[PDB]
From a paper:
Transforming growth factor-β (TGF-β1) is a multifunctional cytokine with key roles in development, immunity, cancer, and fibrosis. Latency of mature TGF-β is determined by non-covalent association with its N-terminal prodomain cleaved by furin during biosynthesis. Interestingly, both TGF-β1 and -β3 LAPs contain the integrin binding motif RGDLXXL/I and bind to two integrins, αvβ6 and αvβ8, which together account for the majority of TGF-β1, and some of TGF-β3 function, in vivo.
Single particle cryo-EM studies provided structures of L-TGF-β3/GARP (2.9Å), comparable with that of L-TGF-β1/GARP (3.0Å). The portion of the straitjacket in contact with GARP almost identical in both structures. Such increased intrinsic flexibility suggests that L-TGF-β3 is less constrained and contains higher basal entropy than L-TGF-β1. A detailed comparison of sequence and structure reveals that the lasso loop of L-TGF-β3 (lasso) is not only shorter than L-TGF-β1 (lasso) but also less conserved in key residues interacting with mature TGF-β53. The high basal activity of L-TGF-β3 was unexpected, which we attribute to the increased intrinsic entropy of straitjacket and lasso loops compared to TGF-β1.
Numbering used by the authors:
A (entry chain I): 26 to 112, 116 to 280, 312 to 591
B (entry chain B): 1 to 52, 74 to 88, 107 to 111, 122 to 136, 143 to 150, 160 to 164, 176 to 202, 252 to 264, ...
C (entry chain A): 3 to 56, 81 to 86, 121 to 124, 177 to 190, 254 to 263, 278 to 328, 341 to 389
The structure:
Amino acid sequence: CKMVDKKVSCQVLGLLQVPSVLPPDTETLDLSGNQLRSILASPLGFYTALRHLDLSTNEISFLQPGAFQALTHLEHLSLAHNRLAMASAGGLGPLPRVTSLDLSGNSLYSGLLERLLGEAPSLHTLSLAENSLTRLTRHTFRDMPALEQLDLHSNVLMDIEDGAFEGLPRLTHLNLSRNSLTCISDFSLQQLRVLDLSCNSIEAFQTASQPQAEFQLTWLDLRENKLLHFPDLAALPRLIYLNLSNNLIRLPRPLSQLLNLDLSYNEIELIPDSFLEHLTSLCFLNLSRNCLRTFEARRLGSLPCLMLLDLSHNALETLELGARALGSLRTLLLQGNALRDLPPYTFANLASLQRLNLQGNRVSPCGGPDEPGPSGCVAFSGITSLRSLSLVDNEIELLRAGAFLHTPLTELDLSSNPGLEVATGALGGLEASLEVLALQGNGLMVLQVDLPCFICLKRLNLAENRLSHLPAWTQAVSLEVLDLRNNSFSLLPGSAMGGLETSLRRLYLQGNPLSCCGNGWLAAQLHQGRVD
Amino acid sequence: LSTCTTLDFGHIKKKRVEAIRGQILSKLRLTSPPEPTVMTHVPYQVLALYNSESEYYAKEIHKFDMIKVFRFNLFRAEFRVLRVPNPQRIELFQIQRYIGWLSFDVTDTVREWLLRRESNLGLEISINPHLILMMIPPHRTNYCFRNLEENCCVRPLYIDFRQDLGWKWVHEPKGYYANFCSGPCPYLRSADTTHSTVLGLYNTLNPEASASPCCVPQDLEPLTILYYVGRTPKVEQLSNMVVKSCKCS
Amino acid sequence: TCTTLDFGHIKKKRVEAIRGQILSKLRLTSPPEPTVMTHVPYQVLALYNSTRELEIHKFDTNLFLSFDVTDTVREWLLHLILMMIPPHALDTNYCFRNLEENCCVRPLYIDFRQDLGWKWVHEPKGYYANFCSGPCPYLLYNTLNPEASASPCCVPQDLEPLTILYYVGRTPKVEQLSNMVVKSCKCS
């Protein structure tokens, strides 16, 4: 047994009884992991200076009725993962100075607690997780008015009679996740602040009416349940977080302070007009994996504060966003929908947009301000704030010239658009700012864009395009990664690939038909420190 | 933060009625009810026509091998169930009660052997054998009994044709009770160690280990009705019409 | 029809329900202690492999306490009472060989050591415990009975048992657990 300063450590294994050869001035004492089977008052009472006592993971099953009342200076006591459920006799008595008590993993049951645990004036935290409780009666928690936190997850609770929390006037955290509750009929805990009811079977949720003072609740979690309607939360004016993901909700000031609302994986199909009007302060909103077909924000000044909107994997077909609306939006995710034809100036009215993801739709970009394209194309010509764009798998046949003329974006992605042909000057304007470019899987014969002018380009991806010849670098460009796998490169002259050695870091060729003749530069690179 | 004690079930009753409508039409394979005929009297022939828990728990298995032919101190175990052996018309008797790889599995005729034995006792055949025993070790408003019980149980309801369904063409009977099933079945979350009084809740709240249990009927009964077309009456019986119990499945 | 609910959570909940089902059919508060008894005597395996093997009309074409009189009366037709129809599944084969998105059987395999973490089961090493899933079309209709508390649920029809050989202390135990493998489904 190690000792340092009024503290004793007893190791993982090797004991069957409480030791007695310890100094009598100890103040901490650890015994987890051993093979203890009971706690008798005699050896333990010698240590009247204890303040912390850990007895978890043993096999303790019997506690002498007076064992813990000799210790008058405790503050913490842990008895987790023992076998207390086999204990008529035994139990804990008064515990005046205790402030924490852990009883999780013991397999207790309803009715045993009122005899197991006695008085506790100074308790602040109590943990009863991972037991076999089923019902909370008016008699359960008694004589503990300083309790503040109560952890009851991973039980089997089905009932909560009225008054079970009346003896707790200072509680502020309640945790009832992973239980078996089915219907909630009332809510009257004025002073509570955090409530966690996730992973249950709750079908309906309703709160009280006409309180003396407003409820203080500010954090509510009801994800992964069976709710069928958006709950009525008119009496909770302080709420800041709310999470209703993975339910069955269908849609048909209360929420003037909500800042986070998650509403994914439900069965919503149409959004009433007045619903979005109340949410004045919202900053994040997810509506992914629902069944919407349109989204409207026509009214000017609606959603003033929103910074993220998520609509992926719905079935949208049009977007009626009006100008001077969504003026703060920065991220807009729309992948997996069926958008085809849009008004030309849809995305150019968003004043702060910075990241757009359009993968999997069938959008065809415009052709620059000068000589635009046909009707129904979308204009990416002048979105001054945009910084990232994704157009994977949109079946783009033709990429017109000047498509991104006045958008100083720093990342593009055009992969998996077979039969793509890039008109000359299509990528004009991006030389000064573009950093990443991907064209994998397109299959184009020859690349018309003049790469060596791209000063800032760092990563480039050209895999699975069936190229055979590549333009020539003749300076110290900033490129650092280059991918050419599964192309048709046979010979790599050192003339065209000079100047890249100043900055190149890694590189790939596997899958190409390299020729044994020549290729001295490639051999030199393989000799050098460049990866592969 | 109370739990939930009372729930209204008018919507379930009205949806049940609406479904009974279409169900009876389909059982009678019409796309619309026939318009009522004139009030007619029943003949005498129709009048004469009118006058006229141990499955849940696991079993130990004990095999007792052999020591128109005859088959015959086996009171070691004192278990229940009968044979399933390794190998015209041909059938089997006892020393002469009729009993029937093969199988003759009733949970008896070795209960009697356990109870009383004689000099010879065995099975007959007439115009690697063994036995297999199975028994559970010892340690292992028709159908609900509390007013507005919150469990899965059967609820009462009365169906009468002229009022609810507007069916003038139904003559017998005036109505009947079409009870329904309601109440939730909670999903119980498992653990490796759990108290022995909670191990009895699986048998009734989720016996099938489904991911979402449902409250579904268990016993159902048929309904006989009478109706006229033209001059000829028609006596038709429909099946699966009245509930007698429920179940969580 | 809008039926967006992810398919990995259904698998996770079916497996976690299987755990409690197996533990409570045997009535075990804690899983037994594994032993390295790799040499199981051959006789025990014989028991395991042998268990694993197993209008209305009345009287007293012409028409248009109980016995099975159906054959003779049907032959004659072309005290007794007769019923005559007036002149006017979702099993493994159909679901596994054809694509369906209503109520239907889905496949699942349970390995005791990889899914549940149990090292005390000698035989078998795992089994196929399917499951039922999918929505039901609201009002099949020839056989349906609308009696549940909502739209009909997707519940199993046929179920088959399972044989396990586990080991308690120093003795072997050959069990049989009922209703373990799904084979068909129905809408209520």
